[PDB]
Amino acid sequence: KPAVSVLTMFRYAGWLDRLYMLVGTLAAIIHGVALPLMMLIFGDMTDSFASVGQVSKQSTQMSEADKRAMFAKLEEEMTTYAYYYTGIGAGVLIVAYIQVSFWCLAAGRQIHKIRQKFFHAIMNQEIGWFDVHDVGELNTRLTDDVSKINEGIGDKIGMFFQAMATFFGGFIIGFTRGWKLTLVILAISPVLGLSAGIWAKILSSFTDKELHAYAKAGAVAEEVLAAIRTVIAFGGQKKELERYNNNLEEAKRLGIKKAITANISMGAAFLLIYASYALAFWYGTSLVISKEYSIGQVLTVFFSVLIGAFSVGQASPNIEAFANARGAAYEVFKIIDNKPSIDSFSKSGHKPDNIQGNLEFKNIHFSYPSRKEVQILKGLNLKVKSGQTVALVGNSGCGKSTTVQLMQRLYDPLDGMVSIDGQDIRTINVRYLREIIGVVSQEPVLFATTIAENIRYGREDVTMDEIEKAVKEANAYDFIMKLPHQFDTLVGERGAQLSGGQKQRIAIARALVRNPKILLLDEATSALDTESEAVVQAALDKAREGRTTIVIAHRLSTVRNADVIAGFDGGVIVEQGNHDELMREKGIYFKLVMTQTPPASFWRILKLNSTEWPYFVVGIFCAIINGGLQPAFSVIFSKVVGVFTNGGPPETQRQNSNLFSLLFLILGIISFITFFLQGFTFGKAGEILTKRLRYMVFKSMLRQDVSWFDDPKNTTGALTTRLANDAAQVKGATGSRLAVIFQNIANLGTGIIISLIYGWQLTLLLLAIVPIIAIAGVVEMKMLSGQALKDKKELEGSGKIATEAIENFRTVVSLTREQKFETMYAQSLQIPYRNAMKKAHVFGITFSFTQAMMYFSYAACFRFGAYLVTQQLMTFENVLLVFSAIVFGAMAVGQVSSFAPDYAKATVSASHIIRIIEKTPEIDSYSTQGLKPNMLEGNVQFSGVVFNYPTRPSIPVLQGLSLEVKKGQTLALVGSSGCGKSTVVQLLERFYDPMAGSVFLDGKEIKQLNVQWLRAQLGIVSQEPILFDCSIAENIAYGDNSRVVSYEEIVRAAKEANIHQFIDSLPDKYNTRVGDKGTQLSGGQKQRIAIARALVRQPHILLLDEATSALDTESEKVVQEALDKAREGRTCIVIAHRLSTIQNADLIVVIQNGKVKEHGTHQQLLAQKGIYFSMVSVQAGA
Ligand SMILES: Brc1ccc(Oc2c(Br)cc(Br)cc2Br)c(Br)c1
């Protein structure tokens, strides 16, 4: 919404840039003007053939006589027109180069300047300005917005003016050569504007419906694939597929409905558009029979106007290009034009010599940019004498840290003054002030360059001698020399990551080359390892003694030797003095002392699509007819102008034109009828295989075993996404693109034959010319993408050293050396500039070439069409025919190149989808194999089990685990931590087979047992029960599948679980809808429901996995009261973390390191003393 003055935007264009734009825009208008002229001549060529076309047939007496006057007229005329044509082509060749080159030149020249100025502006902002802003956004704002600006002031303007030139130029010629047809042509404009308006309403409204339509299915898929382990446990994999299939079934119906309507729309629209012209032209005929117009003039106006008419449309994008570029320039120039109070690029203010370094802080009230919300310094008084070293101590607020902030004048204070020597800080030059102050900060930063270079950021003029003394005076010499490459090493976020204590010591060296008279050390020892801390501390102590210093840390080791110590409470300076005095004060300081002590041929996807042998042949046959039908319109048009040009005696013409125009409208209706067909057939044929594919994928997906679903690669979202995209994308490829690709090859084919047989060698020529301009049209785009990628690569290097400068900014400014990064940025940019210059010459040449190639190619159409061909008996009516036929047949091939990516994007999306079906699991629930034992009573043996999770085969969970539990008794399971407790239940559900060892139930190894039948006997109840959205009766009935469960049966289970209070309490009762769509309830009820479905199954085995995990107060007491009633009739395993409620358990088992450690009945483990005793003691105590 905000935008910029048109004149400010160009403020960096002067002298030449203004001229370039003037010559370019000029040439741009000449260029535009060229096309409607070219069409004007196409009238005069017509009148020439038309005068001879009328007189030639008017004879029917003399022959040789017509070999004289006619041919002479054609000779002089055609040569004239051809000469002019060759003229225009040269014209466009020149202006088209001038157009793009100059504008791109201006663009480059300015954007270079914009970029430099912009970065300079970023570095000039004071810190309070950064504190309030997001640096990341600002950098992305550096690289993206300047690009928008460049796009707008680029050759797009030239294009705009070329377009307006064709539009004006079109409608002028439109009006002068006649006022009638133009008005008649504008008259039909609203209709075309109106039909394409139905499209923006249909598309936008229906696009949501499908996104709404599948949103119902992909919801199923989301609550399923999220709940997977549950549906896997309860084996609802047949139902959860059935549901998805039932929503898919609707989606396809809506999908076919859309297919019907959208094609009706497209067809009807097209028919309106073509009827609309055909009337303008037939109206154009009605005025020729009246001898009001010439048959060539009808052309001249009818072309010029439609050209100019569409030229409006072709300009519209460049308007947007420019506008966006204005709006993009607003926030950029706002930084450039913003001026700081502080600067630091300013040359102003005193520069004292012989600074003795006497500092004082007077009544300083300050607040950081968070402003009125907080005031962190309320008053203040502090002096520090020259050569002394003062220490600042405090509990919190780090108002300590603020004084170091004010002393570099990063912020100016609200009220009060900071005084270096006698003078107010604000009277001294900012840069020089920063140059007389050294700084060592808590988190040290090193820019990416050599150590010498980072030290060279202390001062730009320095020699390895001074570097050496500096690092040796920081005692950083010894440790870096050992490092390879010596001072030439690397540092940064990338490469050569070092000890912090070494980084700080390079930082102290950097600070030391500064030879500052004032030192600020903030926390520099804090957040550092104890051993190296002393190493650095020594350097700090050696860094002072030449200087006056203020230091802030939480280390009261370094403070003692400070000449003065200062405490803060609430921004108010409170205690000051030598250490001893402060202790004698027994105040804040003392208190703190005591406290701290693969693209490939995939046919099989089409083989799946072969489920329909028909609906393809229908569409294809139907589309090829449509292909053959298109050029016939050109044939008509050719003979409408043809017979009319070839007329001879005028009486017969008027009756014929009617016949033709009638036929054409019979063809348009036959075209509509074929088009809707080729649309609908493919559409339905797409929508059904969409179902088949999504079905088979979703089916194969429920086949895989928990091992797969654990993968970081596959998460619920990524799968729904993979599920939608891949299925849409293959529909696309077998969809419209193919129908069209066949319609068009048919269109060129049926055109090329007609043309070829009519014109001998006329066509053969056009087929030499067209492919070359096409290819030449492609190579340009290749070069374009090439240059684009290259420049992207090059400005990226610069933006990288920008990112460094502005992300680490508060440090660079502390060191000054902003001019450094300015210069570096500048040098970096210099390559894309010299590049951007070449870009213009290239862009220009390619464009001009592809225009010229078209105009000269036009000259060849007629010069050969006349002369050699029309000096022969071969005729004009045909030359027109072949012009249109071939030239359109080609432009229909233009659609091939456009649908090219739709195929690739589809095959890649097929690539995964054919694999996701074919992948098979280790444990497949689908295998009907497995024993299905007849004997009821459950036992469970875990023997010698070693298990590692497939995702994390590093730290093992189970190593040599062994358990046994008899029927009808509870096995309590305790652990130090982890899924060691929980993995048991997973393995009994056979989510996994163990690596080594084995687990039996009835004495049969489950590994050889039927996977499904196994899980069918299991009473799984987990931490967070996931309930699908549906009647709670169904969430319960989920407990048993392969059969519909009785109402009284799901009642009994809700009676069991103690959930009945709710289920009767509700208005709907058992038909109420749950899952946070229809209704919401707390976890206790959800759980009791999960308990209900657990024992609807009438399992022989409950599995209670930390069932009380999320729960509170009486809710626990009631759920536990349900679980406790659920077991004791069954084999049970309870890993519950309430050991108070495990006290009554037939066996308790303590898991340690995946081995069982302790086991026995409660009092039996209580009789011992060890892990379980410690477990029951700790949380009974706490
Ligand atoms: Br009759 C008659 C036939 C084609 C005409 O222009 C074309 C041409 Br030429 C080609 C196609 Br495809 C569609 C139309 Br509409 C006109 Br104007 C009148």
* Ligand 1 binding pocket mutation candidate from 306, 634, 641, 663 (most atoms within 8 A of CB): 634
- Gap between the Cα atoms of 686 and 689, Å rounded: 6
Distance in Å, CA 209 to ligand 1 centroid:
36
- C-alpha 643/C-alpha 652 separation (Å) is 10
Is residue 657 in contact with ligand 1, taking CB distance under 6 Å? no
Q: 482: Cβ–Cβ under 8 A, 6 or more apart, which residues? A: none
Task: Give the burial string for 657-689 (b: 16+ CB within 10 Å, else e).
Answer: beebbeebbebbeebbebbbbbbbbbbbbbbbb
Residues 6+ apart with CB under 8 A from 4: 326, 327, 329, 330, 333
Q: Tell me, in angstroms, the distance from the centre of ligand 1 to residue 771's CA.
A: 24
**Which ligand 1 atom is at minimum distance from the Cα of 631?**
12
Distance 882 CA to ligand 1 centre (A): 14
Q: How remote is the CA of residue 188 from the centroid of ligand 1, in Å? A: 15
- CA angle 1177/1180/1182 to nearest 5° reads 100
- The closest-lying atom of ligand 1 relative to the alpha carbon of residue 274 is 15
Residue 96 CA to ligand 1 center (angstroms) comes to 30
Question: Does the C-beta of 630 come closer than 6 Å to ligand 1?
Answer: yes
Annotated binding residues for ATP: 394-401, 975-982
| H-only helix segments in 866-948 | 876-898, 900-918
- Centroid of ligand 1 to alpha carbon of 657 (angstroms): 13
Residue 906 CB neighbour total at 10 angstroms: 23
- DSSP element (H, E) containing 998: strand 996-1000
CATH number of 349-597: 3.40.50.300
* 71 CB within 6 A, ligand 1: no
What is the chain's alpha carbon radius of gyration, rounded to the nearest angstrom? 43
> Which amino acid residue places its CA nearest to atom 9 of ligand 1?
634
Mutate to test the pocket of ligand 1, among 184, 185, 273, 274 (most ligand atoms within 8 A of CB): 274
**747 in ligand 1 pocket by Cβ < 6 Å?**
no
Mutate to test the pocket of ligand 1, among 184, 192, 633 (most ligand atoms within 8 A of CB): 633
What token pair was written down for 264?
A: 């009706």
Strand order in the sheet with 381-384: 381-384, 359-365, 415-420, 423-424
* Cα torsion through 1024, 1027, 1029, 1032, rounded to 10: -130
Q: Quote the DSSP letter at residue 493.
A: S
User: Experimental technique used?
Assistant: X-ray
Closest approach atom of ligand 1 to CA 273: 15
Residue pair 1084/1118 in contact (Cβ under 8 Å)? The answer is: yes
Q: Greatest CA span in the chain, whole angstroms? A: 138
The domain defined by 1-348+598-929 carries CATH number 1.20.1560.10: yes
Q: How many CA atoms lie within 13 A of 39 on its CB side?
A: 23
DSSP state of 1046: P
Q: How are strands ordered across the β-sheet holding 970-975?
A: 1018-1021, 1101-1104, 1131-1134, 970-975, 1147-1152, 1155-1160
Q: In the CATH hierarchy, which top-level class contains the domain 930-1182?
A: alpha beta
Sheet of 437-440: strand order equals 437-440, 518-522, 548-552, 389-394, 564-569, 572-577
Amino acid at 340: P
Phi, psi of 422 (to 5 degrees): -85, -30
Nearest CA, atom 13, ligand 1: 633
Task: Determine if ligand 1 sits within 6 Å of the CB of residue 640.
Answer: yes
- Closest CA to ligand 1's atom 16: 278
- Rounded CA gap, 288 and 256, in Å? 48
Q: How many CB atoms lie under 10 A from the CB of residue 1044?
A: 8
Rounded Cα distance between 749 and 739, Å, is: 15
How many angstroms separate the Cα of 54 from the Cα of each of 45, 380, 831, 963? 14, 106, 65, 109
> Ligand 1: does its nearest atom lie under 6 Å from the Cβ of 302?
no
Q: How far apart are CA 185 and CA 805, in angstroms?
A: 60
For residues 259 and 680, the answer to whether their CB atoms sit within 8 Å is yes
Q: In this structure, which residue's CA is closest to atom 5 in ligand 1?
A: 637
Instruction: Decide: 661 in ligand 1 pocket, CB within 6 A.
Output: yes
**Closest atom of ligand 1 relative to the 637 alpha carbon:** 3
Residue 724 CA to residue 726 CA, distance in Å, equals 6
Take atom 8 of ligand 1 and give the residue whose Cα is closest. 634
Q: Probe ligand 1: pick from 279, 303, 630, 636, max atoms within 8 Å of CB?
A: 636
Beta-strand pair 572-577/548-552: unpaired
**Contact assessment for residue 118 and residue 805, using Cβ atoms and an 8 Å cutoff:** no
Task: Give the span between the Cα atoms of 553 and 524, in whole angstroms.
Answer: 7
434 C-alpha to center of ligand 1: Å? Answer: 77
Taking the CA of residue 640 as reference, the ligand 1 atom at the shortest distance is 1
The tokens describing 321, both together, are 């290009």
Ligand 1 atom nearest the C-alpha of 302 is 17
Phi, psi of 117 (to 5 degrees): -55, -45
What is the helix (H) or strand (E) element at residue 875, kind and residue range? none
Q: Which atom of ligand 1 is nearest to the CA of 888?
A: 12
Q: How many angstroms does the Cα of residue 281 sit away from the middle of ligand 1?
A: 9
Q: What is the DSSP letter of 1071?
A: G
Ligand 1: nearest atom to the Cα of 277: 17
DSSP 644-711: HHS--STTTHHHHHHHHHHHHHHHHHHHHHHHHHHHHHHHHHHHHHHHHHHHHHHHHHHHS-HHHHT-
| C-alpha to C-alpha distance for 614 and 124, rounded to whole angstroms | 71
Q: Residue 1160 has which token pair?
A: 């026995």
Q: Which atom of ligand 1 is nearest to the CA of 634?
A: 9
CA distances to 210, 257, 264, 1077 from 250, rounded to whole Å, are 11, 11, 21, 21
1156, two tokens: 């069982």
CA distance linking residue 282 with residue 295, whole number of Å: 11
Query: In 1057-1161, which ranges are continuous DSSP H helix?
Result: 1060-1065, 1083-1096, 1113-1126
- Residue ranges of the chain assigned to CATH 3.40.50.300: 349-597, 930-1182
What spacing in Å lies between the alpha carbon of 668 and ligand 1's midpoint? Answer: 10
Burial class (CB in 10 A: 0-12, 13-18, 19+), 1154: buried
Does residue 297 line the site of ligand 1, with CB under 6 A?
no
Question: How many angstroms does the Cα of residue 288 sit away from the middle of ligand 1?
Answer: 18
Q: List, comma-separated, the residues after which the chain is broken, a break being a C to N distance over 2.5 A; otherwise answer none.
A: 597
The binding site comprises 394-401, 975-982
Check the CA dihedral 1059-1063-1064-1066 and report its sign: positive
